[PDB]
């Protein structure tokens, strides 16, 4: 196939169209980097899907954390339910990276249970890229992680057609030769019928363990289930059950190589050191090899990825970006945060693994199993598009100007900003607060020190006001619980240090306080401030008060931009006759 079908209730509102089409044209004109500058709540996720469909290409949308990768998922689902949309994540978004604390001389094993759901979609994701051209995969920074080679996937593939002759025990083998999927057992798996005309209940294949069970009697091919039959076929494809699978003849040789190293490493470790003389690792190396020649896989296999692949030391790893057709597209959400973090992933891995090698719990060759370097990520790009309200210096210095999109569909507008002295700052912020309770409106405050927030909360309650918390990480459960508590009348105010903590996109909030605007901090930067400001644009009377003594260069930039931004949204509601009205949202249950 290969046709994108973009469903949707609305239509391009704001200045979406200018945006969309500008990007599009720019792909086509063959440009590498483009940056989308979209304000908060102006609808980026949607604008994006439009461009996607105009270029009919397959893409990976990299988000910077589990949750986000999630929202983007479902969202993009409602947009295209007739196309391929997968969710590539990993156990980096949870467990412990088998490390070692030397001082406390305390070891920590790779304790990570296989959470099947994950694996399920990891496999559907890979597969999809060799069948259709209409695929979409949302993923974490984790996509730049080492993975089995792709070619050795489009090779160990079981192409099933009609008219060809294969034993009833011949395919049963290429089948176990790929770490069998579900051809064993709560039964006999896929054993029945027999002869030249067999049965074979090829089930649990992860690439579609959503109960599909493919049956092929003397190819045959007819999608089934745990109940009854459905949907007809004449050509199927079965995929490996591991991303790190290898061919026997190759494994045989890898093993010898592993060995030459473990040997010749103890000789160099013998001479220089005496860290348990050198050895101690022999316990698991050898224990690992024995479990290897006996069975294709083993314990921490992944560690021997470079060796198994049969590629020279230092080699750059294989990644999900290598499974995408030669001309694909990558969307990077919240790019000013993602990018930087995905940058120092190699450094932190290398750091925590070199330790295990000095202490000797894995060998040099284990270093070769790592994430990409930022340059290795670069050399792999075909064409990208960065999305963010606060684009970083990288995107701007590589991109040819930006592509502005700053008009919300409701026609709401970035607040107005005030800046007042630190003297008498509290009795002032109380007065400007009482007045919001009298108009049924909520507030949000921010400090720098957890002892300044604390110093306030009480001061506030002692003023006769329903007030919020003072503790940063108050779980996530009770956390979502008190957000709900606010947009309801429970409280009128709310103090926090970090307000950029998602969930805080509330409409009943009309005023936002920034108590140490001119101080030093990450939470007081050109980018970070603008972002805190947008928390006051979910309303028709959004205002921001900045309490300070001086006007930092950061403060300046923010204010300057918000201004300009607001002007243009206003001259626009003019030409069109729109009166800004506050968004409404329902108030569910936790
Ligand atoms: N053209 C449109 N017509 C109607 N609704 C739209 C349109 N475009 C976008 N929306 C809406 O805008 C909302 C938020 O858009 P989007 O997800 O991009 O917010 P955002 O840009 O991510 O905000 P933030 O930067 O704060 O995260 C959604 O509720 C979405 O339905
Ligand atoms: Mg977003
Ligand atoms: Zn460069
Ligand atoms: Zn218009």
Curated annotation (Swiss-Prot):
Q: Which domain of life is it from?
A: Bacteria
Matching entries from PROSITE patterns are given as:
HELICASE_ATP_BIND_1, HELICASE_CTER, UVR
Write down the SMART domains for this protein, in alphabetical order. Answer: DEXDc, HELICc
Q: How is the cofactor bound?
A: Binds 1 Mg(2+) ion per subunit.
Keywords for the protein's UniProt record, in alphabetical order: ATP-binding, Cytoplasm, DNA damage, DNA excision, DNA repair, Excision nuclease, Nucleotide-binding, SOS response
Entries under InterPro entries matching the protein: Helicase/UvrB_N, Helicase_ATP-bd, Helicase_C-like, P-loop_NTPase, UVR_dom, UVR_dom_sf, UvrB, UvrB_inter
Q: What is this protein called?
A: UvrABC system protein B
Q: Where in the cell is it found?
A: Cytoplasm
UniProt GO MF annotations:
ATP binding; ATP hydrolysis activity; DNA binding; excinuclease ABC activity
Cofactor dependency: Mg(2+)
Q: Subunit structure, briefly?
A: Forms a heterotetramer with UvrA during the search for lesions. Interacts with UvrC in an incision complex.
Taxonomic lineage from the root: Bacteria, Bacillati, Bacillota, Bacilli, Bacillales
Q: What does this protein do?
A: The UvrABC repair system catalyzes the recognition and processing of DNA lesions. A damage recognition complex composed of 2 UvrA and 2 UvrB subunits scans DNA for abnormalities. Upon binding of the UvrA(2)B(2) complex to a putative damaged site, the DNA wraps around one UvrB monomer. DNA wrap is dependent on ATP binding by UvrB and probably causes local melting of the DNA helix, facilitating insertion of UvrB beta-hairpin between the DNA strands. Then UvrB probes one DNA strand for the presence of a lesion.
């Amino acid at each position: 196939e290969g046709r994108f079908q973009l469903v949707a209730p609305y239509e391009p509102q704001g200045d979406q169209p200018q945006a969309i089409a500008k990007l599009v044209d720019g792909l086509r004109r063959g440009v590498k980097h483009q940056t989308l500058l979209g304000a908060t709540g102006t609808g980026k996720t949607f604008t994006i899907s439009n461009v996607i469909a105009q270029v009919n290409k397959p893409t990976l949308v990299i988000a910077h954390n589990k949750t986000l990768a999630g929202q983007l998922y479902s969202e993009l689902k409602e947009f295209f339910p007739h196309n391929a949309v997968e969710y590539f994540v990993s156990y980096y978004d949870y467990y412990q990276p088998e490390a070692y604390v030397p001082q406390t001389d305390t070891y920590i094993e790779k304790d990570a249970k296989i959470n099947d759901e994950i694996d399920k979609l990891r496999h559907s994701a890979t597969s999809a890229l060799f069948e259709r051209r209409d695929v979409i995969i949302v993923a974490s920074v984790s996509c730049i992680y080492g993975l089995g080679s792709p070619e050795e996937y489009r090779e160990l593939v079981v192409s099933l057609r009609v008219g060809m002759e294969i034993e009833r025990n011949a395919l049963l083998r290429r089948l176990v030769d790929i770490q069998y999927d579900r051809n064993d057992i709560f039964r006999g798996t896929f054993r029945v019928r027999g002869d030249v005309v067999e049965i074979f209940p090829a089930s649990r294949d992860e690439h579609c363990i959503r109960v599909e069970f493919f049956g092929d009697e003397i190819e045959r091919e007819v999608d089934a289930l745990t109940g009854k039959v459905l949907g007809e076929r004449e050509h199927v494809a079965i995929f490996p059950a591991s991303h790190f699978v290898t061919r026997e003849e190759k494994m045989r040789l890898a093993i010898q190589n592993i060995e030459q190293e473990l040997e010749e490493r103890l000789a160099e470790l013998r001479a220089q050191g005496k860290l348990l003389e050198a050895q101690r690792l022999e316990q698991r190396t050898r224990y690992d090899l024995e479990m290897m020649r006996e069975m294709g896989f083993c314990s921490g296999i992944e560690n021997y990825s470079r060796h198994l692949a049969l590629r020279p030391p230092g080699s750059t790893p294989y990644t999900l970006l290598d499974y995408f057709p030669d001309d694909f597209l990558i969307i990077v959400d919240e790019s000013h945060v993602t990018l930087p973090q995905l940058r120092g992933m190699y450094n932190g891995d290398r750091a925590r693994k070199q330790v295990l090698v000095d202490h000797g719990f894995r060998l040099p060759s284990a270093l070769d199993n790592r994430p990409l370097t930022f340059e290795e990520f670069e050399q792999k790009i075909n064409q990208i598009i960065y999305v963010s309200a606060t684009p970083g210096p990288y995107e701007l210095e590589h991109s040819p100007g930006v592509v502005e999109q700053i008009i919300r569909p409701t026609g709401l507008l970035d607040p107005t900003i005030d800046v007042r002295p630190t003297k008498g700052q509290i009795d002032d912020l109380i007065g400007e607060i009482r007045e919001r309770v009298e108009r049924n409106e909520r507030t949000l405050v921010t400090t720098l020190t957890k002892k300044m927030a604390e110093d306030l909360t009480d001061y506030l309650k002692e003023a006769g006001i329903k007030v919020a918390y003072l503790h940063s990480e108050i779980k996530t459960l009770e956390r979502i619980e008190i957000i709900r508590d606010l947009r309801l009348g429970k409280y009128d105010v709310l103090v926090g240090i970090n307000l950029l903590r998602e969930g805080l996109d509330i409409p009943e909030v009309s005023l936002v306080a920034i108590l140490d605007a001119d101080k030093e901090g990450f939470l007081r930067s050109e980018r970070s401030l603008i972002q805190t400001i947008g928390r006051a644009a979910r309303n028709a009377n959004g205002h921001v008060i900045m309490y300070a003594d001086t006007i930092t260069k950061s403060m300046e930039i923010a204010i300057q931009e918000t201004k300009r931004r607001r002007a243009i949204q206003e001259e626009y509601n003019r030409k069109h006759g729109i009166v800004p009205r506050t968004v409404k949202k329902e108030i569910r249950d936790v």
